[PDB]
Scaffold this active site. Structure first.
Site, PDB file in Angstrom:
ATOM      1  N   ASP A 128       0.799  -1.206   0.000  1.00  0.00           N
ATOM      2  CA  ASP A 128       0.000   0.000   0.000  1.00  0.00           C
ATOM      3  C   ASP A 128       0.844   1.274   0.000  1.00  0.00           C
ATOM      4  O   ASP A 128       1.268   1.753   1.063  1.00  0.00           O
ATOM      5  CB  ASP A 128      -0.902  -0.034   1.231  1.00  0.00           C
ATOM      6  N   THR A 129       1.067   1.839  -1.183  1.00  0.00           N
ATOM      7  CA  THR A 129       1.872   3.047  -1.294  1.00  0.00           C
ATOM      8  C   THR A 129       1.200   4.254  -0.650  1.00  0.00           C
ATOM      9  O   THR A 129       1.851   5.272  -0.401  1.00  0.00           O
ATOM     10  CB  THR A 129       2.213   3.390  -2.753  1.00  0.00           C
ATOM     11  N   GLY A 130      -0.091   4.136  -0.360  1.00  0.00           N
ATOM     12  CA  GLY A 130      -0.805   5.240   0.263  1.00  0.00           C
ATOM     13  C   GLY A 130      -0.794   5.171   1.792  1.00  0.00           C
ATOM     14  O   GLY A 130      -1.468   5.954   2.440  1.00  0.00           O
TER      15      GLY A 130
END
Lengths: 97, 97
Positions: free
Chosen positions: B25-27
């Site tokens: 999850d890059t967020g």
């Protein structure tokens, strides 16, 4: 381009002729931007606090660091602009290591 | 490897000797896994519904598709296993398009 994850991956997206800062979020299925003026018909959708109502616009043209793509964009009182997978696949974004 | 975003980027992580499925999850700034048994001292942390209490373990060894890295792992009643940037930078994960 190649983006590292040392800081939040914020990029610029051109949508509705306006430019905006959104976060590339591989952990989000959909794309949701803060209130803006988009042309076209839309439909209601219910989706960062609890539930919120938003407007679902389909096949909206967008541009993320060059790379022109089209797809669904949810517009509403989102706490933050988020570019989800639905659009990330359209610009050929991949995770690499 | 190279992961496309047509579906949720779920991978296998080895932590505490156990294997688990987490979402890249890059967020997400941090990594939070569901309850498991980790060795060591930890400290309280308050962070998908409202606030939840979790246990912060530092410098924990982990392995994501090969690639051995170490970093902070939050363990708690998270609705889902999430690999955040804090660890993604450690395995040299980047976004490319």
């Amino acid at each position: 381009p190649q983006i590292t994850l040392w800081k939040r991956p914020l990029v610029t997206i051109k949508i509705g002729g306006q430019l905006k800062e959104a976060l590339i979020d591989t952990g989000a299925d959909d794309t949701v931007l803060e209130e803006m003026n988009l042309p076209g018909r839309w439909k209601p959708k219910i989706i960062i606090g609890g539930l919120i109502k938003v407007r679902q616009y389909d096949q909206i043209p967008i541009e993320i660091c060059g790379h022109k793509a089209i797809g669904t964009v949810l517009i509403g009182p989102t706490p933050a602009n988020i570019i989800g997978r639905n659009l990330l696949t359209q610009i050929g974004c991949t995770l690499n290591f």
